[PDB]
Amino acid sequence: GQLRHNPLDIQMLSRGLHEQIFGQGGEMPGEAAVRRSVEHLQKHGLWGQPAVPLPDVELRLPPLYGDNLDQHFRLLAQKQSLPYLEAANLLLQAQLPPKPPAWAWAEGWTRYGPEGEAVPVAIPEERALVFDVEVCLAEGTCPTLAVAISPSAWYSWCSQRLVEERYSWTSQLSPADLIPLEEQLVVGHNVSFDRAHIREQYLIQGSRMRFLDTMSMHMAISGLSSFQRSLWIAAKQISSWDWLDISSVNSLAEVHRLYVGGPPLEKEPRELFVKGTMKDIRENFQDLMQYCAQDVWATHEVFQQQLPLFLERCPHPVTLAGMLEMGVSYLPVNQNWERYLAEAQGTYEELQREMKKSLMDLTNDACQLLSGERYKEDPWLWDLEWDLQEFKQKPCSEEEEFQQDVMARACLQKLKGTTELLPKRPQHLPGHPGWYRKLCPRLDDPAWTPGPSLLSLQMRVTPKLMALTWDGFPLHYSERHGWGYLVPGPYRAIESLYRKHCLESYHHGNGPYNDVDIPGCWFFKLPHKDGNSCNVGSPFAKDFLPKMEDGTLQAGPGGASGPRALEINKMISFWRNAHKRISSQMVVWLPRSALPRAVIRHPDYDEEGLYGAILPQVVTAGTITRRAVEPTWLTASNARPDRVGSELKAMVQAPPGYTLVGADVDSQELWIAAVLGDAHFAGMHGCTAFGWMTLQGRKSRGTDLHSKTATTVGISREHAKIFNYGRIYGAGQPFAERLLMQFNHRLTQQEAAEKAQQMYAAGGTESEMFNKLESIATSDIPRTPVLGCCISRALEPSAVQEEFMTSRVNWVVQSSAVDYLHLMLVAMKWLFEEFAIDGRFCISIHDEVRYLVREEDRYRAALALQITNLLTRCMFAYKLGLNDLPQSVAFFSAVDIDRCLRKEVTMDCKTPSNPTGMERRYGIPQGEALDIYQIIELTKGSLEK
Amino acid sequence: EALLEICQRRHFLSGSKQQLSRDSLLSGCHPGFGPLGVELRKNLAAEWWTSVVVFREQVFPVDALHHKPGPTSGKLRENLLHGALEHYVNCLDLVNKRLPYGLAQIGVCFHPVKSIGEKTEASLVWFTPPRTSNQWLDFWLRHRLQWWRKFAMSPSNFSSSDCQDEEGRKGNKLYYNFPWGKELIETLWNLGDHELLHMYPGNVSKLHGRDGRKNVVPCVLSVNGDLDRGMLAYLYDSFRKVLKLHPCLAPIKVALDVGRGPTLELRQVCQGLFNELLENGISVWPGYLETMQSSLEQLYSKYDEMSILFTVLVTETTLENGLIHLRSRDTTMKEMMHISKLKDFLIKYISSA
Amino acid sequence: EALLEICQRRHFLSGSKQQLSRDSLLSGCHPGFGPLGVELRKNLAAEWWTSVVVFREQVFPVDALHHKPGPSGKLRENLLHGALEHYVNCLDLVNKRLPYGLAQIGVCFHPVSIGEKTEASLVWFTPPRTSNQWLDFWLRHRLQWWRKFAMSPSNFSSSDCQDEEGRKGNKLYYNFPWGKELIETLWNLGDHELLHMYPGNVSKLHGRDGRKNVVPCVLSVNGDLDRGMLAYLYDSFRKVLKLHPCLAPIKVALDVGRGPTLELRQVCQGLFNELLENGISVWPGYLETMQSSLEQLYSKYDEMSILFTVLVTETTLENGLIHLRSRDTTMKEMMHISKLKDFLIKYISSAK
DNA sequence: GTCGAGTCTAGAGGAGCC
DNA sequence: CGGGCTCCTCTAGACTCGAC
Ligand SMILES: Nc1ccn([C@H]2C[C@H](O)[C@@H](COP(=O)(O)OP(=O)(O)OP(=O)(O)O)O2)c(=O)n1
Ligand SMILES: O=C(Nc1ccn(-c2ccccc2)n1)N[C@H]1CCOc2c(Cl)cccc21
Ligand SMILES: [Ca+2]
Structure with a gap:
């Protein structure tokens, strides 16, 4: 039968699939190993508990090449990366003539032959290049000029927005406004910026051009952590410091120094392309072109040094193939993108005005404390600047009425000329106090609005203006210790307010800080969610909403003024920090000619609508764990009912005739850690208590580790993710207690501590995984257990001895997860190319993969994704040598098939800026989440057509 | 009631205390508004006209008569919607038969109270394609609520309610939370083509408006605000005895x-x-x-x-x-x-x- | 006649071509005004306001209702009665001074059918000594205002007339192509109406003039902004309506x-x-x-x-x-x- | 030529993602 | 000993510069 079990009674894979992944002949675990596993499981009280068998799956998988799974993946990745390694080798051997002395002032592409001449060309027409793009930030996101290095010649490009000057250029970018190019490899430093400026990249159909990044390879070879970058910059200007000499920050100058050495790399002192205007660029064309040539030459010289070191420390072809596939992200958009930007900005402005109305009102109503010097009796605003300045100095007939009008006009016309005794620029609100003055926009300010329009909840004066009290004590700010409050004991006026509050140190908290020396009062810091060592920067944080609703934090005006202020702050906190990124996103709109015929002919095609794309500017390896990095799309918030503009990802909408098919891995790092611990203890699945708990439980049934923790301690499931992954990678009991108190408001100090030890109870459940991680991390050259990729030279034990231990131990599992992502991308590309599944890679977040599939091939894409997950899990098992895979983790829980990017297929993104919803406003129906059996039924268990 | 005392002291209101009870103000049986009341109402009408008509290429003024002639004796108008629906066909030629387009008017309407209460009302009859009618209704609800909250010291006191007609037609009602309660200051209705077809029996080709590339009979969206009760709303919202009306609304600068x-x-x-x-x-x-x-x-x-x-x-x-x-x-x-x-x-x- | 066709076609007027007639336009029984006509009327009203109320502290706006209640009410027939009703309580605006005026623009209902006309009116309370002087002053200003926007200000005329009672009054006209029509009228009405509306205890009608208390005299200046609009359309009329820049609806x-x-x-x-x-x-x-x-x-x-x-x-x-x-x-x-x-x-x- | 008003970085706390 | 990232606003200290 297809039902199979291990010596420890865990349902393994179906027989048909096992005969195709592992074949036959794997070594039996042995009696001693099984006895040890049974003893461990019985000791932890986990033996003898049956589980309902999951239904068997019978699949005819595509023919796997080679003799086993590793050879299969190697062959796939070598076929993927073979031409691009050839292009890199071409860039690694050829020698280049020196840059020409006189650049060409021409529109288009220019090729510099020998003796510095300039020849007009249509495209660089080279397999391998080093590319750099210069963009004038004053004219928007259109490229300005670019210099490209070929293994044979120099190349230069200039936009028509540089050669020609016109009154107005289109704000809506088009492919014709981009840099023309196009089996090609393009190398650069932060190539994703330069990829975004290539004309042919925005086409919906894919292109064979791939990109290699110097920051990514630097992070792969000699990269630095964020704390490491801080320490390195502090030093360039722990007991281990040998890592400094073999590492650098991602800046091109620093990387060139690290790898190639030689004379220092110099930057343009004026920074024209960021601060200057187009006239400056036309005036200074030669200098800026020479600087671009210098940067591209430095990048070429750095790539020459990095490529062999990268191929040495990361020898598996899957790593390079995945890094090539991870850098071709693609996000399609439409006119709903413009509507979303407009609506989100409008909602943000409306809420901003609503909050500033209350703000300005109270401030304008506090100026009366100046009259009579009454601010000394105000418990809040006594410390501010109340001093005032001075203004410094250096019937009638028709004829009678006309004459009187002219005389009354001339009387002031004489007075209108006495301006000679006044300064050129008038003093700003000389009469009002200094505090009021600072909060009013100056008259010259381009955007001027009447009143204290420069006031916000983040200002250090706002809580005093709104008279916020914590347990009835006025909030007081200490520069050394952040925010806080004053317990009495205007000290006379502070007690009077507290006495009134009681009608409507004896107080225990963060202790009376004696440094503040406020007379007749004590200082207590506001309880911060991350402990007593941290300082509060603003009482209007999200963590203070429960305390405001409970009434321990109160507003002076009372009523809903305080809670509404905190609610509006929570609504606009994301947009306030991300609107510059989201609004400025480089959107390029495709004309009807460049669109595919499927999009044009589809019923949902709109003749009056726009269709475009956003290429995420992804740093492929921007992490010591070799993760991707993106300022916007890797920080894009999920749709929440209270957050303005949080439907950002829902605006990534497939064109007509297309859908987004993707999935997210389930308990990825939990399973990776458990399988490592299992392979360390005995060569079976479920040997350890942690591995048995991980396997025993389904996400649909709500019994997995995250859901079990959420039920046990009461927090949400994402809060349980934070809790569990913190505990795995180093969080102590105080961290767990603080996280529980933060995410579960009903718990007390004692109750949270007890529920921490319940999750921290376990010779233990988690012993073997910890031992394996600490053994690999302390190895002479730590490497990924699956693809064998080495750690950065800055984190090896020789470079850092007994330092950054948490970073390395977490690096093991996290870089293994990156290996998982590389394997998934490789296998998905292989299945898409082999069976002609029309589609392409859309975007990957650190454990999610999205594919812009055509409508007719959504279920084939779903089956391909399930097969990919199956093969990747079996590869993880095979490298560790377990020679089996549980049926519990063989496939995805569900594959999302949606027309927009959202966490759940059923949730509707009803946010303050999107109150109607995606269905009512933009006409986006709900998607479907399908597990393995449903996909098998829909596609007959085959990827063919 | 101190607000009305100050208003009549500063010539916002007229008459004695007997005619200035809040019931009389709400009903419309009060005497005429005082001179500063006239100026404040003029400022409200000017802001309304700006926001609705001035900055929109497809909102036009309409002249509806105060009396309804014929079926034997005529009657004073109770709503401005009827005259705008009468001018629908005539003003279809301005926008070149392109929907959506609007006909806006500020005028006085006579409500039975048997006394007669006069109310100054600002109307916008917004002909829309049937498919996007709910979208336009939500847009106009948000726009009108934002407009009322724009000049408000306490915007939270302006609210909306989703209501259904006795015939099941969708609509929204705006409100201002007066000290005594919650009174209606504006109302939006997605009427449909019932009134247009009743007022224009027979051929529907004349009623067709070119939505995109297809002719269609517009669904009438009726927005109707009360500028007298809106003026009272802003006087209460404003109200050291200081009014603090908006700079764009304050009668005397x-x-x-x-x-x-x-x-x-x-x-x-x-x-x-x-x-x-x-x-x-x-x-x-x-x-x-x-x-x-x-x-x-x-x-x-x-x-x-x-x-x-x-x-x-x-x-x-x-x-x-x-x-x-x-x-x-x-x-x-x-x-x-x-x-x-x-x-x-x-x-x-x-x-x- | 061709001007009326242009006005109907270019959305100055409203209604069918056979529905608009000269008499219906002069009386108030026309269907209404097109958007351009409405905006021209608003321009005329703004200019009238600028030239009367804006540049004089002595002139204030009033709000007279359309219906007069009490002895089963009826539609108002003129804007004078509400001004006279508001005369007593408006003395606190000027601190019981004298002279001062009340001006308004509103629809007046006239039996014909029911005719509605947009009448711009100004009542002027003055001591009787300077009544004729103020009447002449207002006549001058009104004729200047009417002729200010005119392509051919010879068409606007003025005349002197006597009522049945025998009080001095002027009548302002516009020479339409068919003949002169009354677009404004000035009358020196005396104190009969104010006493009749407020009989007994005339001490409440006293106005201060150099510390001397006087029961004032009322001057009625009744224009016709609808007939004013018609006059300017006729005067402004290659088919081009050379309206004055301060009156033309769309620029x-x-x-x-x-x-x-x-x-x-x-x-x-x-x-x-x-x-x-x-x-x-x-x-x-x-x-x-x-x-x-x-x-x-x-x-x-x-x-x-x-x-x-x-x-x-x-x-x-x-x-x-x-x-x-x-x-x-x-x-x-x-x-x-x-x-x-x-x-x-x-x-x-x-x-301008 | 003195000193007070604009510009500029650096650091700290808050807030999105996995 | 959570880890790996990303960016923002606000405040303070130092620098520049110009007008009197
Ligand atoms: N606070 C967090 C969040 C995430 N991760 C890491 C561990 C996860 O394996 C990976 C992906 O994050 P998910 O939130 O997707 O975690 P899971 O994949 O376990 O959850 P799910 O089963 O819902 O996908 O990121 C982490 O270490 N700490
Ligand atoms: O709202 C504002 N904005 C601003 C911003 C700069 N300003 C300025 C204006 C003139 C000279 C200097 C500076 N004014 N100012 C109000 C607030 C306080 O009161 C007044 C008064 Cl008494 C007079 C004028 C304006 C105001
Ligand atoms: Ca996951």
């Missing part, structure tokens, strides 16, 4: 005064400044023409109750150096600015508000 | 000449928003696709009393030049786009 002496020259200075601010669209209260000449504190309180934005004080020193004093109602603080830069700033403070 | 016609449509529409929309923020009314002719001939567009805008027709073309994106055409003179000039708003404001101010 600038109060102009004098100093010590010489009287004759300062009179000429004030006359020139008065004419300047008048020619620049800024309404001025000539306090220099008063003969009683009370103290500064009494004038300050008097002007505070009248929602006076600024108090210009031309003293003798305005002759010497051209500097004039200015007190702001917002903060009760005095500042000095030159006589050459008063008009430009006043235009700035108002426009940017 | 600028903004259009698109070439492609690309997106960029030209963008620059036209920016120009539209700029001109609107600067108080200039613009006809958004750039929205229309498949435009007619430029000559036909010029004729249409001339019949609509459009001051200037601005055409934005492909060249505008290159340098900023826009084709500018004037209503009064059929002369085309090219001006930079950034200088258009200041030019329009300057032209409006100059013709």
Whole structure:
């Protein structure tokens, strides 16, 4: 039968699939190993508990090449990366003539032959290049000029927005406004910026051009952590410091120094392309072109040094193939993108005005404390600047009425000329106090609005203006210790307010800080969610909403003024920090000619609508764990009912005739850690208590580790993710207690501590995984257990001895997860190319993969994704040598098939800026989440057509 | 009730206390609005006209008569929607038969109370394609609520409710939370083509509006606000006894005064400044023409109750150096600015508000 | 007659062609006004307000209702009665001083059918000694205001008349092509009405004139803003309605000449928003696709009393030049786009 | 030539993602 | 001993520069 079990009674894979992944002949675990596993499981009280068998799956998988799974993946990745390694080798051997002395002032592409001449060309027409793009930030996101290095010649490009000057250029970018190019490899430093400026990249159909990044390879070879970058910059200007000499920050100058050495790399002192205007660029064309040539030459010289070191420390072809596939992200958009930007900005402005109305009102109503010097009796605003300045100095007939009008006009016309005794620029609100003055926009300010329009909840004066009290004590700010409050004991006026509050140190908290020396009062810091060592920067944080609703934090005006202020702050906190990124996103709109015929002919095609794309500017390896990095799309918030503009990802909408098919891995790092611990203890699945708990439980049934923790301690499931992954990678009991108190408001100090030890109870459940991680991390050259990729030279034990231990131990599992992502991308590309599944890679977040599939091939894409997950899990098992895979983790829980990017297929993104919803406003129906059996039924268990 | 006391003291309202009970104001049986009441209502109508008609390429004014002739004796109009529906076909030719387009009007309507209550109402009949009718209704609900909250010191007191007609037609109702309760200030209805088809029986080709590339009969969206109760709403929202109406709504902008002496020259200075601010669209209260000449504190309180934005004080020193004093109602603080830069700033403070 | 056809066609009036007649326009029984007619009436009312109430502290606005309750009410027939009712309580505005006036614009209902007319009225309370002088002063100012916007101010006339009682009064006319019609009337009505409305204890009607208390005299200045609009349409009438710049409803016609449509529409929309923020009314002719001939567009805008027709073309994106055409003179000039708003404001101010 | 008003970085606390 | 990232606003100290 297809039902199979291990010596420890865990349902393994179906027989048909096992005969195709592992074949036959794997070594039996042995009696001693099984006895040890049974003893461990019985000791932890986990033996003898049956589980309902999951239904068997019978699949005819595509023919796997080679003799086993590793050879299969190697062959796939070598076929993927073979031409691009050839292009890199071409860039690694050829020698280049020196840059020409006189650049060409021409529109288009220019090729510099020998003796510095300039020849007009249509495209660089080279397999391998080093590319750099210069963009004038004053004219928007259109490229300005670019210099490209070929293994044979120099190349230069200039936009028509540089050669020609016109009154107005289109704000809506088009492919014709981009840099023309196009089996090609393009190398650069932060190539994703330069990829975004290539004309042919925005086409919906894919292109064979791939990109290699110097920051990514630097992070792969000699990269630095964020704390490491801080320490390195502090030093360039722990007991281990040998890592400094073999590492650098991602800046091109620093990387060139690290790898190639030689004379220092110099930057343009004026920074024209960021601060200057187009006239400056036309005036200074030669200098800026020479600087671009210098940067591209430095990048070429750095790539020459990095490529062999990268191929040495990361020898598996899957790593390079995945890094090539991870850098071709693609996000399609439409006119709903413009509507979303407009609506989100409008909602943000409306809420901003609503909050500033209350703000300005109270401030304008506090100026009366100046009259009579009454601010000394105000418990809040006594410390501010109340001093005032001075203004410094250096019937009638028709004829009678006309004459009187002219005389009354001339009387002031004489007075209108006495301006000679006044300064050129008038003093700003000389009469009002200094505090009021600072909060009013100056008259010259381009955007001027009447009143204290420069006031916000983040200002250090706002809580005093709104008279916020914590347990009835006025909030007081200490520069050394952040925010806080004053317990009495205007000290006379502070007690009077507290006495009134009681009608409507004896107080225990963060202790009376004696440094503040406020007379007749004590200082207590506001309880911060991350402990007593941290300082509060603003009482209007999200963590203070429960305390405001409970009434321990109160507003002076009372009523809903305080809670509404905190609610509006929570609504606009994301947009306030991300609107510059989201609004400025480089959107390029495709004309009807460049669109595919499927999009044009589809019923949902709109003749009056726009269709475009956003290429995420992804740093492929921007992490010591070799993760991707993106300022916007890797920080894009999920749709929440209270957050303005949080439907950002829902605006990534497939064109007509297309859908987004993707999935997210389930308990990825939990399973990776458990399988490592299992392979360390005995060569079976479920040997350890942690591995048995991980396997025993389904996400649909709500019994997995995250859901079990959420039920046990009461927090949400994402809060349980934070809790569990913190505990795995180093969080102590105080961290767990603080996280529980933060995410579960009903718990007390004692109750949270007890529920921490319940999750921290376990010779233990988690012993073997910890031992394996600490053994690999302390190895002479730590490497990924699956693809064998080495750690950065800055984190090896020789470079850092007994330092950054948490970073390395977490690096093991996290870089293994990156290996998982590389394997998934490789296998998905292989299945898409082999069976002609029309589609392409859309975007990957650190454990999610999205594919812009055509409508007719959504279920084939779903089956391909399930097969990919199956093969990747079996590869993880095979490298560790377990020679089996549980049926519990063989496939995805569900594959999302949606027309927009959202966490759940059923949730509707009803946010303050999107109150109607995606269905009512933009006409986006709900998607479907399908597990393995449903996909098998829909596609007959085959990827063919 | 102190608000109505101050309003009748400062000529926002008329009559005695008997006619100024809140029931009389709400019903419409009060006498006419006072002069400052006329100015405040004019400012509300001007802001409404700006937002709805001025900045939109497809909203046009319409002249609907106050009486409904014929079926034997005629009647006074109760709503402005009927005349706009009568002008629908005529104004279809302006937008070249392209939907959506609107017909806006501010007028007086007569509601039975058997007394007659007169209400000034601002209407927008917004012909829309049937498919996007709910979208346009939600857009107009949000726009109108934002407009009412734009001039509000407490925008939360302006609310909306989703209501259904006795025939099941969708609609929304705006409100202002008065101290006594929650009164209706505006109403939107997605009427449909019922009224258009009833008023224009027979062929429907004349009623067709070109939505995109297809002809369609518009679904009438009726927006109707109460500018009298809206004026009362803003008087309550505004209300040291100070109104604090909006700078774009305050009836009288600038109060102009004098100093010590010489009287004759300062009179000429004030006359020139008065004419300047008048020619620049800024309404001025000539306090220099008063003969009683009370103290500064009494004038300050008097002007505070009248929602006076600024108090210009031309003293003798305005002759010497051209500097004039200015007190702001917002903060009760005095500042000095030159006589050459008063008009430009006043235009700035108002426009940017 | 052709002017009425133009007004109906260009949305100055409303209703069917056979529905609009001279008598129905003079009486108040016409269907109403088109959007251009409504805006011309608003312009006339704003000019009347500027020339009467805006530039005089002594003149205040009032709010008289349409119906008079009590002895089963009826529609108001004139704006005088409400002003006389408001006379007593309005003395606190002037601190019981004298003279002072009350002015208003509103619809007055006249039996004919029910005729509605937009009548602009001003009542002037004065001591009887200077009553004739104030009457002559107001007559001068009103005739100056009427002739200010006129292409041919000879058509506006003035006359002297006596009522049945025998009080001095003037009648202001406009010489329509069919004959002179009453567009305004001034009467020195005395104190009969004020005493009849307020009998007994005349101490409440005393006005201070040099510390002397006087029961005042009322001057009635009743114009016809609807007949004023008709007079200006007739006087302003190649078919061109050369309305005065301060009265013409829409000033600028903004259009698109070439492609690309997106960029030209963008620059036209920016120009539209700029001109609107600067108080200039613009006809958004750039929205229309498949435009007619430029000559036909010029004729249409001339019949609509459009001051200037601005055409934005492909060249505008290159340098900023826009084709500018004037209503009064059929002369085309090219001006930079950034200088258009200041030019329009300057032209409006100059013709004022 | 003195000193006070604009510009500029650096650091700290808050807030999105996995 | 959570880890790996990303960016923002606000405040303070130092520098520049210009007008009197
Ligand atoms: N606070 C967090 C969040 C995430 N991760 C890491 C561990 C996860 O394996 C990976 C992906 O995050 P998910 O939130 O997707 O975690 P799971 O994949 O376990 O959850 P799910 O089963 O819902 O996908 O990121 C982490 O270490 N700490
Ligand atoms: O709202 C504002 N904005 C601003 C911003 C700079 N400003 C300025 C204006 C003139 C000279 C200097 C500075 N003004 N100012 C109000 C608030 C306080 O009161 C007044 C008064 Cl008394 C007079 C004028 C304006 C105001
Ligand atoms: Ca996951």
